[PDB]
Amino acid sequence: KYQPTEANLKARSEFQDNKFGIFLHWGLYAMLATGEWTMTNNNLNYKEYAKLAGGFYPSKFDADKWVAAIKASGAKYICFTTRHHEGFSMFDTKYSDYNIVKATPFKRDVVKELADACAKHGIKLHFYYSHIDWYREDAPQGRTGRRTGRPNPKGDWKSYYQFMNNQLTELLTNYGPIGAIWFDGWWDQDINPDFDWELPEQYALIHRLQPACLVGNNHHQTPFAGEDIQIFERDLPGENTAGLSGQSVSHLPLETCETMNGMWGYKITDQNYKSTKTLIHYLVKAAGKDANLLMNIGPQPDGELPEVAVQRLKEVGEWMSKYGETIYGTRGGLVAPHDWGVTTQKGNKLYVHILNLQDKALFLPIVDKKVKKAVVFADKTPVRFTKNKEGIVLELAKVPTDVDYVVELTIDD
Ligand SMILES: C[C@@H]1O[C@H](O)[C@@H](O)[C@H](O)[C@@H]1O
């Protein structure tokens, strides 16, 4: 069965170490500015929808600007939608003329420009790839895309499968080293429990071209053999407030994805961006649950990242410059997430992230381990603490009102 290589295991460790990445959802749907599900939500004819590519020209696109804005947040990788459910390829593929170079006046391989900029800024680059397709006539139809006017609902699974494997070969050979392939769409065939996605062969292909490329699949299931990371959508592992994540937590590297407003693709009615404080909290709570955070922006049809999104990124980076040592290269801390906050850990250090506390003292259930030292991370002032039957009790100088009041504990062994 699945034997992950030494390189793959190293890449899993580096992934868990980086903690924070940015999701970019960009395609033809940015013209419509009503969301990447609009083609199926509105039952748009597939040929009519394809006509939009003739008017696609994000004149202000600047991959360098994007990646500099993203790096100023402290994020270490980008996950970019190379091709979403709409079926439009944002890269110069030779297996379909329905792509940004051939089909639009822009005539520019957006994916290549991104990969170059990412390489220049030392930001790893992951590729989102859609297992389902609402445009191609050989794509089989599950629950979505049943009213786009296509002629063969059953599709030609052999043709379409060969097409995906050839495009993945393109993406893995032409754009230098690729952090991960992020598959999505599996849930589209869940109504058909016998649907054979032929995943062993595809994962084998990916690992055969680049053995350190991680493989994820947003299937909301217990991971399948050959996957290298587990995806939780709009929820933290073991949580299910958004209704998409009832699956158990595995021993694979965990990653949570989330939007900065309410949608993945650019939405012109939706300018309700979460505060900087909410965003830092998402990141820290994820780290405290031993998971990465993948935070999304939907770029505009003129090619600029939304301005408010960029300012949020800038302010999150201002916080990260001060507190990143408590997040980077850590794992889920020895003390489970509580209502007051979370803990992370690295070496002999356990970081207590006090996010939400009304008191001037905090009880921690640390029994076996001995707490050798306790200081305020920000300036290294003492934290008095007393042992008791069930743990320790920190005595704080004030009721914390910071975004994250971090106390650094040194433990033995
Ligand atoms: C990552 C998100 O998860 C869902 O399954 C997708 O269908 C959304 O459009 C988005 O890509």
Side-chain angles (χ1 to χ4, degrees):
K1 302 289 105 191
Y2 184 45
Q3 259 311 338
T5 76
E6 230 167 40
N8 197 266
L9 296 200
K10 156 277 315 191
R12 312 187 167 171
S13 229
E14 298 174 345
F15 178 78
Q16 298 180 282
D17 284 347
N18 290 315
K19 275 309 173 238
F20 185 29
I22 294 301
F23 225 149
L24 294 173
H25 272 82
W26 203 30
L28 280 192
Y29 43 80
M31 266 163 104
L32 290 182
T34 54
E36 78 285 358
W37 276 62
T38 303
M39 205 182 166
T40 200
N41 284 341
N42 286 347
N43 298 319
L44 304 186
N45 181 275
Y46 69 117
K47 300 187 140 132
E48 196 71 3
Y49 188 105
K51 294 182 190 182
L52 302 160
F56 193 52
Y57 201 80
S59 45
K60 316 196 149 165
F61 176 73
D62 186 335
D64 260 289
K65 267 172 89 121
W66 286 22
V67 174
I70 284 169
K71 192 200 220 277
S73 75
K76 277 341 198 161
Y77 62 110
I78 283 151
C79 186
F80 180 82
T81 53
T82 67
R83 170 171 143 291
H84 202 268
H85 310 332
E86 54 161 21
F88 188 71
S89 293
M90 295 297 274
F91 58 110
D92 193 16
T93 183
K94 62 191 321 278
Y95 295 72
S96 174
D97 279 92
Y98 191 42
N99 74 66
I100 182 136
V101 182
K102 310 279 133 222
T104 77
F106 201 51
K107 325 224 67 61
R108 292 162 51 179
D109 199 331
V110 155
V111 169
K112 169 104 200 135
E113 294 184 20
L114 229 42
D116 286 348
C118 279
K120 172 175 141 180
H121 296 83
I123 297 283
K124 266 64 196 135
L125 169 68
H126 305 185
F127 283 161
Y128 173 112
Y129 198 83
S130 171
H131 268 155
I132 70 184
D133 196 316
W134 295 332
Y135 174 78
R136 291 182 60 89
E137 300 170 304
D138 58 351
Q141 288 169 27
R143 207 179 18 258
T144 56
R146 263 177 317 190
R147 276 153 265 179
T148 64
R150 288 179 287 178
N152 309 119
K154 309 254 200 163
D156 186 353
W157 170 240
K158 149 201 304 281
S159 184
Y160 178 69
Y161 183 68
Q162 171 86 331
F163 164 83
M164 317 212 278
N165 283 328
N166 301 145
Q167 280 211 134
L168 286 163
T169 296
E170 294 205 15
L171 290 174
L172 289 179
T173 57
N174 288 305
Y175 304 92
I178 292 315
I181 297 312
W182 215 94
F183 281 118
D184 180 54
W186 182 97
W187 38 259
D188 191 54
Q189 285 293 338
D190 59 4
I191 35 171
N192 183 357
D194 215 73
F195 196 88
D196 190 347
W197 285 97
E198 299 208 84
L199 291 196
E201 170 175 10
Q202 200 161 86
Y203 297 166
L205 173 282
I206 286 166
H207 286 126
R208 228 208 310 120
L209 202 293
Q210 300 196 31
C213 182
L214 301 306
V215 166
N217 192 318
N218 182 37
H219 47 52
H220 307 139
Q221 305 285 301
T222 166
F224 291 135
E227 280 156 39
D228 300 314
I229 58 176
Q230 188 173 2
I231 289 155
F232 285 87
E233 188 188 341
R234 292 192 184 274
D235 261 296
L236 268 46
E239 271 172 48
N240 198 14
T241 51
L244 322 158
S245 309
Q247 80 269 38
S248 42
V249 182
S250 73
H251 329 75
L252 270 87
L254 316 156
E255 186 191 51
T256 279
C257 47
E258 190 67 66
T259 59
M260 211 179 290
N261 58 1
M263 184 57 42
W264 305 99
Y266 171 73
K267 220 174 160 209
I268 193 160
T269 53
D270 183 14
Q271 312 294 350
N272 204 29
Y273 278 95
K274 281 139 217 190
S275 61
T276 305
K277 171 180 172 178
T278 298
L279 295 168
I280 294 162
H281 277 199
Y282 272 102
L283 177 58
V284 173
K285 276 176 219 196
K289 211 94 55 163
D290 200 32
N292 277 35
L293 181 67
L294 179 63
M295 181 54 47
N296 178 83
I297 295 175
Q300 313 172 352
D302 72 358
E304 251 162 22
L305 298 183
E307 142 183 50
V308 170
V310 171
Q311 182 61 36
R312 291 301 202 276
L313 290 170
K314 153 150 156 213
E315 303 178 352
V316 163
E318 288 171 3
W319 183 91
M320 276 296 265
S321 80
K322 202 287 167 297
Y323 294 95
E325 168 172 3
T326 76
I327 306 284
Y328 291 137
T330 70
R331 299 277 184 285
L334 163 147
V335 160
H338 282 62
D339 285 339
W340 51 256
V342 298
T343 74
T344 58
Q345 61 177 33
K346 164 165 76 184
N348 68 327
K349 297 281 180 343
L350 181 71
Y351 302 85
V352 184
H353 304 268
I354 302 168
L355 313 173
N356 174 46
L357 180 70
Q358 318 168 12
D359 306 324
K360 289 162 70 222
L362 176 55
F363 163 82
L364 301 186
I366 316 185
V367 172
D368 318 314
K369 283 334 271 192
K370 246 62 163 213
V371 185
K372 280 183 26 204
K373 200 200 306 147
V375 316
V376 169
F377 174 81
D379 53 28
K380 309 310 205 223
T381 325
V383 198
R384 343 158 177 260
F385 70 90
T386 60
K387 275 264 161 204
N388 61 56
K389 205 223 153 151
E390 306 290 347
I392 80 191
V393 173
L394 309 169
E395 338 180 308
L396 311 174
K398 223 311 169 190
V399 185
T401 62
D402 301 83
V403 173
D404 184 7
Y405 198 53
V406 181
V407 181
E408 189 176 52
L409 306 191
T410 308
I411 48 77
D412 162 47
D413 284 88

